[PDB]
């Protein structure tokens, strides 16, 4: 029954929020729908794999809150393998490259590629992180899909293909599905195209030793009986002095306040009294999550390394089940594995096959891309289709279709009487990620501390000291990168010289 | 506790399903979340208005199923007033017109307008009503918004503005929010642009005497105590011999089968065991409903008729709160009134205002458009904002954003084990309308009859004889309408 704050959801954001409230002397209860904590993070343990992340996994520089929280819980990170060459596979052929991104040799094509990334970052700087709908061209950009924007910016098919793969991999959705204003915000609030797309010095630099699921598990340990598993929340009543929160097994919880730390659309699974105000009522029907199957194929050895390939592949083409891979070998060098994502429409399409049929398609692809028959000899396989999760809705995160973020975006984290909103979707820095889950969790917790008269207003939002274990190198551009013309810019220069 | 079929939702679709099954001899319960039946239809009664439809209201030729069901319940229609001239309000002036659609005088603009309606119907001819994802160009049309399609097709701002208003009014959503495939299907499955937009001989021809809310009320009267009000469903368990359906007030129901007669996305409000299959699990987070406030301003007399205006107004522009109106005066000539809809982003914007502030804006608009100070003296006002409704999600109906219909469309009415799917959104003719609700409820009821062995497969989908009271005249086009070139076509001849 009675407590100070009920937290709905025991994923990273809920658990971080509960921890902060608990550490400040409040009595907190966490109501988790599933028979486990973690949510969109989930670490499988068995003897074949030892451990493996089937949900959220990567952390990197500038993600200072998740790093601090994990370190305080006694966790360590290790570096994803990027020693040897990356591979860009396009038009049925493989092109090895070192450095973060595939080199472009054709000068016209180079101009177009350079301009594209540059412009995304240029547009992004127009977009406030904490209020994307305040960008000067918010409406114009929101009324357009990412597909339209690409068709306008990209004067070569090469640039358009690469841009498309970039969108698909960043947000597990198709370019025609998403708002351009939202996608531009999403990249900017992770610190730009380079930071989001990179391994070394970017979002994919590291994983946790033992798996990310430990974050939520270790917080559960600290809280003890306060976390209630298999308690899906079905009903919230705010008509009386204390908030009443009811679960599916008919248990009743009474609190002063509530944090909702679930994906915004899953708010639909809860019946509200009084009804939600109109903007929130409609917003939660407008905000789907992306589609992805995470797949890990195990080998006797990380044989790609011997061919001077790190295991990173960027794979273009409709026929490829997987569009990107990373080496998922353990830091000690054993349990050789390749991790790959089946994305957006391919997740839907390939879900119809058996596990054994998906494994076969992946190996045949890896064998072609790596030029290696050994890829046809897997020793084990694990996968998770997040699209089938009643209590997630999809992965990685929530996307906004055209027109939604300007009309409804301002209510995402607006309180509803005594209900406050956490969950990575409400973050302002690495929203969509484990980092954003911690930011939103702790911010929602501090909103309540402020409402109770425990902290001043200026302390709701709190800046984070930079990790000393995972330093951020700045993102830099060369002079040519800054000032080279676009394709039409070059065409203008040509017409002008015709005098 | 125990019965043959649980129907979730007591709107028209659920009521029609429950009535059909009950007439077959089966034991039915209807579980309804609200303290009332009707859902997206709702008839308010008070002395000032007598009665008024604050939700779904209009019916017209080709809507044979809603007309038959209502006739059986003892209801009658009357004709929406369209005797006098319609008004098109453009760049701050009123251009009265007779005939269904506002005339265009500039020759270039005329060609652009003409080509646009014609092209919409032409495209719809390649879209199958019962499987729009099977259109030959399905992916291409689904990957574009209606805003992109209008940008390609319309060489004039005039056409593009009127096409935009058309989209806004039909589906209470912005051109950039919706898939081109889905919107083209939507119009085609209502019989085309003329049929969907027309009062005389179209969807807006008629209203029910005493209100559409009576259809659901009278089926509830028929079903006695089988309708359970204030029973929102929260949990459905299919793991056992009988389906178990639990409600929020902790009641338990048990049945051989289930009909879901609620808006698809409102499926999210129910926890399932076992989990729903993947495609439905995601589909139901991908299908929002539109945004509308319905508003009725009452006057002492229908004063517009004296100026030879019927009350129908089409109003261009961002400044207007309402883009279209109809006469809402009762058949007797009393309770004089104008109905208007506040649509899409305007519903969102103007919801912040008070009721009285909305009344003022409407009255000043109508005064300008009708050219009468009499519009400034309302005797009464009623409105309903459907955006606030937890158990509707919006009005009129569900729209599909780009990419959704091709990827998820086929799952909408696919049965999940012992759950069958009703609700206007699953209909194949006038989906989105009261008519679609009856089509879908009855079909979902017959799917269950066939699963039970009581009827053969070829009886699941049943045709409907044409109403004698509301017969349909054919949709015609003139020779010039068919063969005049588009703007780029006239350019190619130059
Ligand atoms: C799925 C996924 C996510 C992901 C990714 C790859 C995949 C396949 N890769 C990532 C990565 O490499 N690095 C990273 O930082 N993030 C990555 N992501 C995203 C990341 O996993 C998520 O952003 C993060 O896990 C989300 O945390 P958050 O705490 O905000 O949200 P949640 O995990 O979904 O937890 C919500 C919990 O609430 C429970 N729930 C749902 N409904 C109810 C009700 N009605 N009542 C009670 N509890 C409820 C859920 O069960 C869940 O535990
Ligand atoms: C809102 C609206 C609708 C409308 C319109 C104008 C407005 C402002 N104009 C129309 C018109 O002029 N002509 C016409 O034919 N249609 C018009 N529309 C749309 C029309 O009203 C709808 O297509 C139709 O009413 C929909 O019927 P349907 O039976 O398919 O669906 P519903 O009315 O929403 O009924 C659903 C019921 O289910 C209940 N519910 C919801 N969730 C639950 C749960 N969890 N458990 C139990 N019951 C639930 C709802 O409360 C509702 O009663
Ligand atoms: C191998 N290469 C070049 C790349 C390039 C960009 C990438 N972007 C991501 C963005 C988010 C994410 N999550 C798991 C959230 C995973 C990845 S993996 C990834 C791999
Ligand atoms: C007055 N004129 C010319 C028009 C033209 C088209 C129209 N379209 C509608 C479409 C649906 C609808 N509903 C209430 C669902 C109402 C209307 S009102 C309407 C009025």
Q: Are residues A392 and A407 located together in one domain of the fold?
A: no
What's the structural domain count of chain B?
3
Q: Are residues B69 and B186 located together in one domain of the fold?
A: no
- The rounded distance, in Å, linking the Cα atoms of A2 and B157 is 62
Nearest ligand to the CA of A202 is 3
> What tokens appear for B142 in the block?
């689904």
Residues B19/B49, Cβ–Cβ less than 8 Å? no
Question: For residues A347-368, b (16+ Cβ closer than 10 Å) or e, as one string?
Answer: bbebbeeeeeebbbbbbebbeb
- The rounded distance, in Å, linking the Cα atoms of A335 and A382 is 12
Residues B313/B333, Cβ–Cβ less than 8 Å? no
Q: Is residue A90 helix, strand or coil?
A: strand
Q: How many Cα neighbours within 13 Å face the side chain of A270?
A: 33
Neighbours of A2 (CB within 10 A): 11
- Report which DSSP code applies to A247: E
Q: Are residues B423 and B376 located together in one domain of the fold?
A: no
Domain stop point among A400, A427, A448: A400
Q: Are residues A116 and A188 located together in one domain of the fold?
A: yes
- The rounded distance, in Å, linking the Cα atoms of B159 and B153 is 9
Contacts of residue B115, defined as CB under 8 A and 6 or more positions apart, other chains included, come to B153, B484, B485, B486, B487, B489
Q: Which residue of chain A is at minimal alpha-carbon distance from B408?
A: A348
Residues A54/A40, Cβ–Cβ less than 8 Å? no
Q: Is residue A482 part of a domain?
A: no
Mutate to test the pocket of ligand 3, among A198, A206, A324, A394 (most ligand atoms within 8 A of CB): A324
CATH number reported for the structural domain that contains residue B316 in this entry: 3.90.660.10
Ligand 3 centroid from CA B367, angstroms: 59
Pairing of strands A309-315, A85-90: parallel
Q: Are residues A280 and A412 located together in one domain of the fold?
A: yes
Q: At what angle do helices A12-23 and A434-451 cross, to 10 degrees?
A: 40
Q: Is residue B167 part of a domain?
A: yes
Q: Are residues A256 and A358 located together in one domain of the fold?
A: no
Ligand 4 centroid from CA B326, angstroms: 8
Q: Are residues A219 and A323 located together in one domain of the fold?
A: no
- The rounded distance, in Å, linking the Cα atoms of B383 and B329 is 16
Helices (H), B302-433: 345-350, 355-370, 404-408
Q: Which of B235, B387, B402 sits opposite A177 (nearest CB)?
A: B402
Bridge partners, residue A245, by sequence: A236, A253
Q: Residue count of chain A, please give it.
A: 499
- The rounded distance, in Å, linking the Cα atoms of A220 and A228 is 10
Ligand 1 centroid from CA A38, angstroms: 7
Going along B316-465, which residue ranges are E strands? 324-327, 337-343, 380-385, 419-421
CA-nearest of A341, A344, A352 to A288 is A344
> What tokens appear for A232 in the block?
């899906």
Q: Is residue B358 part of a domain?
A: yes
Residues A61/A201, Cβ–Cβ less than 8 Å? yes
Q: Are residues A326 and A365 located together in one domain of the fold?
A: yes
A203 φ, ψ (degrees, to nearest 5): -65, -25
Pairing of strands A271-273, B252-255: unpaired
Q: Is residue B118 helix, strand or coil?
A: helix
Q: Which of A271, A281, A389 sits opposite B234 (nearest CB)?
A: A271
Q: B263 to chain A, minimum CA–CA distance in Å?
A: 11
As for chain B, the residues directly before each break of C–N over 2.5 Å are none
- The rounded distance, in Å, linking the Cα atoms of A241 and A308 is 66
Q: What is B39-93 written as a DSSP string? A: TT--EEEETTTEEEESS--EE-TT-HHHHHHHHHTT--EEE---SSEEEEEETTE
Q: Is residue A477 part of a domain?
A: no
Dihedral of the alpha carbons of A126, A129, A133, A137, in degrees to the nearest 10: 10
Note whether B407 contacts A348, CB cutoff 8 Å.
yes
Instruction: List ligand 3's pocket residues with C-beta within 6 A.
Output: A 58, 169-170, 197, 203-204, 312, 314, 324, 326, 396
- The rounded distance, in Å, linking the Cα atoms of A315 and B216 is 56
- Report which DSSP code applies to A465: P
Q: Is residue A20 helix, strand or coil?
A: helix
Q: Residue count of chain B, please give it.
A: 494
Q: Which chain A residues have a beta carbon less than 8 Å from that of B281?
A: 387-390, 393
Domain stop point among A383, A400, A417: A400
> What tokens appear for A81 in the block?
């393998």
Mutate to test the pocket of ligand 2, among B53, B54, B55 (most ligand atoms within 8 A of CB): B55
> What tokens appear for B41 in the block?
């239809």
Ligand 1, atom 7, residue with closest C-alpha: A55
Q: Are residues B344 and B384 located together in one domain of the fold?
A: yes
Q: Which chain B residues have a beta carbon less than 8 Å from that of A395?
A: none
Cα torsion angle, A338, A344, A350, A352, sign: positive
Q: Are residues A186 and A111 located together in one domain of the fold?
A: yes
Q: Which of A177, A269, A385 sits opposite B269 (nearest CB)?
A: A269
Q: Which chain B residues have a beta carbon less than 8 Å from that of A351?
A: 278
CA-nearest of B404, B137, B266 to A173 is B404
Q: Which residue of chain B is at minimal alpha-carbon distance from A263?
A: B285
- Structural domain of residue A176, as residue ranges? 106-197
Q: What's the farthest any 2 CA atoms get from each other in chain B?
A: 76
Contacts of residue A278, defined as CB under 8 A and 6 or more positions apart, other chains included, come to B351, B385, B387, B388
The ligand 1 atom at the shortest distance from the C-alpha of residue A430 is 15
> What tokens appear for B28 in the block?
């039915």
Asked if A352 reaches chain B (Cβ–Cβ under 8 Å), the answer is no
Q: Are residues A389 and A413 located together in one domain of the fold?
A: no
Pairing of strands A5-8, A257-260: parallel
Cα torsion angle, A447, A450, A455, A458, sign: positive
Contacts of residue B105, defined as CB under 8 A and 6 or more positions apart, other chains included, come to none
- The rounded distance, in Å, linking the Cα atoms of A244 and A236 is 6
The single residue listed with the structure tokens 């129901």 is: B253
- The rounded distance, in Å, linking the Cα atoms of A311 and A82 is 8
Cα torsion angle, B12, B17, B18, B23, sign: positive
Residue A283 CA, distance from chain mean position = 20
Query: Exposed, middle or buried, A23 (CB in 10 Å: 0-12/13-18/19+)?
Result: exposed
Q: Which residue of chain B is at minimal alpha-carbon distance from A399?
A: B286
Q: Is residue A408 helix, strand or coil?
A: helix
- The rounded distance, in Å, linking the Cα atoms of B347 and B172 is 9
Q: Residue A357 belongs to what H/E stretch?
A: helix A355-369
Q: How far is CA B330 from CA B52, B60, B129, B322, in A?
A: 9, 17, 35, 21
Neighbours of A253 (CB within 10 A): 22
Q: What is B258-322 written as a DSSP string? A: EEE-S-GGGGGGSEEESPPPHHHHHHTTS--B--EEEEEEE-SS-GGGGGTEEEEEEE-SSS-S-
Residues B181/B127, Cβ–Cβ less than 8 Å? yes
Pairing of strands B58-59, B206-208: antiparallel
- The rounded distance, in Å, linking the Cα atoms of A80 and A98 is 15
Q: Is residue A350 part of a domain?
A: yes
Question: Chain B neighbours among A 100-119 (CB < 8 Å)?
Answer: none
Residue B311 CA, distance from chain mean position = 21
A234 φ, ψ (degrees, to nearest 5): -115, -10
CATH number reported for the structural domain that contains residue B261 in this entry: 3.50.50.60
- The rounded distance, in Å, linking the Cα atoms of B370 and B304 is 7
Domain stop point among B197, B226, B243: B197
Asked if B290 reaches chain A (Cβ–Cβ under 8 Å), the answer is no
Question: Chain B neighbours among A 198-217 (CB < 8 Å)?
Answer: none
- The rounded distance, in Å, linking the Cα atoms of A80 and A310 is 10
Residues B213/B43, Cβ–Cβ less than 8 Å? yes
Contacts of residue B127, defined as CB under 8 A and 6 or more positions apart, other chains included, come to B135, B181, B184, B185, B188
- Report which DSSP code applies to B226: G
Helices (H), B176-269: 180-188, 193-197, 213-223
Asked if A140 reaches chain B (Cβ–Cβ under 8 Å), the answer is no
Question: Chain B neighbours among A 434-463 (CB < 8 Å)?
Answer: none
Note whether A403 contacts B176, CB cutoff 8 Å.
yes
Neighbours of B180 (CB within 10 A): 25
Residues A209/A50, Cβ–Cβ less than 8 Å? no
- Report which DSSP code applies to B484: S
Neighbours of A320 (CB within 10 A): 21
Q: Are residues B294 and B380 located together in one domain of the fold?
A: yes
Q: Is residue A292 part of a domain?
A: yes
CB pairs under 8 A between A and B: 124
Cα torsion angle, B183, B185, B190, B195, sign: positive
Q: Is residue B347 part of a domain?
A: yes
Neighbours of A105 (CB within 10 A): 6
Pairing of strands B206-208, B77-79: antiparallel
Residues A7/A17, Cβ–Cβ less than 8 Å? yes
Neighbours of A468 (CB within 10 A): 8
Contacts of residue A334, defined as CB under 8 A and 6 or more positions apart, other chains included, come to none
Ligand 1 centroid from CA A393, angstroms: 10
Q: How far is CA A496 from CA A41, A484, B242, in A?
A: 56, 17, 79
Note whether A234 contacts B234, CB cutoff 8 Å.
yes
Method: X-ray
Q: What is A92-106 written as a DSSP string? A: TEEEEE-SSS----S
Pairing of strands A233-237, A271-273: parallel
Note whether A393 contacts B285, CB cutoff 8 Å.
yes
Q: Which chain A residues have a beta carbon less than 8 Å from that of B250?
A: 250
CATH number reported for the structural domain that contains residue B188 in this entry: 1.10.405.10
CA-nearest of A135, A140, A133, A110 to A125 is A135
Contacts of residue B107, defined as CB under 8 A and 6 or more positions apart, other chains included, come to none
Q: Is residue A474 part of a domain?
A: no
């Amino acid at each position: 029954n009675k407590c100070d704050v009920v937290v709905v959801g025991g994923g990273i954001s809920g658990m971080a929020a509960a921890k902060l409230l608990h550490d400040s002397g409040l009595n907190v209860v966490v109501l988790e729908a599933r028979d486990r904590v973690g949510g969109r993070t989930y670490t499988l343990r068995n003897q074949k794999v030892k451990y493996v992340d089937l949900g959220g996994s990567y952390v990197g520089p500038t993600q200072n809150r998740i790093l601090r929280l994990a370190k305080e819980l006694g966790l360590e990170t290790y570096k994803v393998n990027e020693v040897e060459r990356l591979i860009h596979h396009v038009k049925g052929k493989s092109y090895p490259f070192r450095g973060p991104f595939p080199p472009v040799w054709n000068p016209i094509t180079y101009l177009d590629h350079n301009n594209f990334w540059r412009t995304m970052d240029d547009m992004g700087r127009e977009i406030p992180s904490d209020a994307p709908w305040k960008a000067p061209l918010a409406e114009e950009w929101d009324n357009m899909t990412m597909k339209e924007l690409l068709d306008k910016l990209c004067w070569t098919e090469s640039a358009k293909q690469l841009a498309t793969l970039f969108v698909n991999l960043c947000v597990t959705a198709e370019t025609h599905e998403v708002s351009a204003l939202w996608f531009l915000w999403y990249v900017k609030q992770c610190g730009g195209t380079t930071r989001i797309a990179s391994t070394t010095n970017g979002g994919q630099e590291r994983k946790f030793v033992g798996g990310s699921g430990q974050v939520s598990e270790r917080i559960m340990d600290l809280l003890g009986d306060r976390v209630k598993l298999e308690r899906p929340v079905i009903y919230i009543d705010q008509t009386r002095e204390n908030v009443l929160v009811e679960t599916l097994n008919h248990e009743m919880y009474e609190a002063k306040y509530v944090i909702s730390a679930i994906p915004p659309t899953l708010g639909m699974k809860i019946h509200f009294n009084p009804p939600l105000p109109m903007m929130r009522n409609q917003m939660i029907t407008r905000v789907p999550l992306g589609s992805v199957i995470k797949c890990i194929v195990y080998y006797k050895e990380p044989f790609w390394r011997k061919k001077d390939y790190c295991g990173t592949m960027i794979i273009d083409g409709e026929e490829a089940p997987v569009a990107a891979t990373l080496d998922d070998t353990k830091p000690e060098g054993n349990y050789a594995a390749i991790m790959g994502f089946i994305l957006a429409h391919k997740a839907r399409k390939l879900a119809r096959l058996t596990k054994e049929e998906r494994l076969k398609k992946l190996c045949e692809l890896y064998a072609k891309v790596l030029g290696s028959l050994e890829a046809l000899e897997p020793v084990h396989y694990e996968e998770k289709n997040w699209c089938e999760e009643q209590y997630s809705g999809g992965c990685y995160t929530t996307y906004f279709p055209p027109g939604i973020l300007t009309q409804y975006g301002r209510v995402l984290r607006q309180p509803v009487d005594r209900i406050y909103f956490a969950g990575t979707e409400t973050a302002t820095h690495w929203s969509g990620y484990m980092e954003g889950a911690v930011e939103a969790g702790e911010r929602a917790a501090r909103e309540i501390l402020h409402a109770m008269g425990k902290i001043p207003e200026d302390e709701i939002w709190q800046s984070e000291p930079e990790s000393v274990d995972v330093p951020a190198q700045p993102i830099t551009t060369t002079f040519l990168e800054r000032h080279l013309p676009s394709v039409p810019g070059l065409l203008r220069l040509i017409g002008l010289t015709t005098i």
